[PDB]
């Protein structure tokens, strides 16, 4: 029995934008959280159905890790049950959940002088998603009775727009990195 490791999940670089996020699966390793307890400087922990004491001596049947780059208002939005652009369009998260949620502030790395446009998010949808499903699509949005015929024109918008993060960023706006883990307590 050996290390997982967590460092490849947490410490690694250039992780995904809010849509087309990624899912990773973890098995057959020692938990050894104490290195996380010592090393972590993370500005938020919140755990649902579990407590940080009574956390060692637990066996988790499956472990999944999901990674995001986010603007701090979304950091409050990522809680279950909320409303907002994210909760309506992207990464809906259910109230019935057993995980714990981690965030730390990456402004020294993720922000860019002149903006880090590569982080992309979706602004209009005909209906709102069920939890844990993606969309990777483009079908040009119509804001009138007449078609815009698959091309730009009147009342016709491309659904995608770019975040900007800068030096001297708005402290609530500036970028955050968020990681989520999901567990079930049914088998070793």
């Amino acid at each position, epitope marked *: 029995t050996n290390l997982c490791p967590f460092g490849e999940v947490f410490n690694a*670089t250039r992780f995904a934008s809010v849509y087309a996020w990624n899912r990773k699966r973890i098995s057959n390793c020692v938990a050894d959280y104490s290195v996380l307890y010592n090393s972590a400087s993370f500005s938020t922990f919140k755990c649902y159905g579990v407590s940080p004491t009574k956390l060692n001596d637990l066996c988790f049947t499956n472990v999944y890790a999901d990674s995001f780059v986010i603007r701090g208002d979304e950091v409050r939005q990522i809680a279950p049950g909320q409303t907002g652009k994210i909760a309506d369009y992207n990464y809906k998260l259910p109230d019935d959940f057993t995980g714990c949620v981690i965030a730390w502030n990456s402004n*020294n*790395l*993720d*922000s*860019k*002088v*002149g*903006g880090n*446009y590569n982080y992309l998010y979706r602004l209009f949808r005909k209906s709102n998603l069920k939890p844990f499903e993606r969309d990777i699509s483009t079908e040009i949005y119509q804001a009138g009775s007449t078609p815009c015929n698959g091309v730009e024109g009147f009342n016709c918008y491309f659904p995608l727009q770019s975040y900007g993060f*800068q*030096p001297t960023n708005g402290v609530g706006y500036q970028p955050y990195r968020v990681v989520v883990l999901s567990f079930e307590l049914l088998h070793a």
Partner: antibody
Amino acid sequence: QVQLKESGPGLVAPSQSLSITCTVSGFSLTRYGVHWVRQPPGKGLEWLGVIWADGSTYYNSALMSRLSISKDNSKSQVFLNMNSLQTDDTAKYYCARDGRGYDDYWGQGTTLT
Amino acid sequence: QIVLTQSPAIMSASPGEKVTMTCSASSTVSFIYWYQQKPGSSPRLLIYDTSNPASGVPVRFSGSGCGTSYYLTISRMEAEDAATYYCQQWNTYPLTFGAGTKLEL
């Protein structure tokens, strides 16, 4: 063409002041950003840089007395003036523009002191 | 962040003698841009994030790095004459320009 051009470069004098202007054509100063970089003779370059839509300013300098941006925002030119610049600085002065990325264009001006 | 640079003084006997470029930095930097200069006159031309080239430069370049240290590797032809390199960081102000000197003859 998309262009940066250098205009009234400073010329030799016993007086230690020097002036230089740079001029831009094929894009507006309200649409992109332009950055200003200096080289001492026999040395690497030295930098002053700011990012704006218009009218904004950012600076870091080892010295800043008499120093803030000088600009003629009719698109005509950008201007530099310092009392002692002839001895202190500016063997060559360079005029440069940046966009989102991979659209970065450079112009070179030569200053006599 | 201050950045520090090393360079050799070297005499070649053929092309294909491999070449390395290095920069070392005082503190964490996330984004860097990669530039080559010819001596004597100093227009500027850029190789940007993900180390993709701009227009008008040979295809044989690749860059990958580790924190506080950046590397890209070149193998053949005109770069033996043409390459002098500068490294600059774009994560926070001031944008320090860096310094050094390099030659091959």
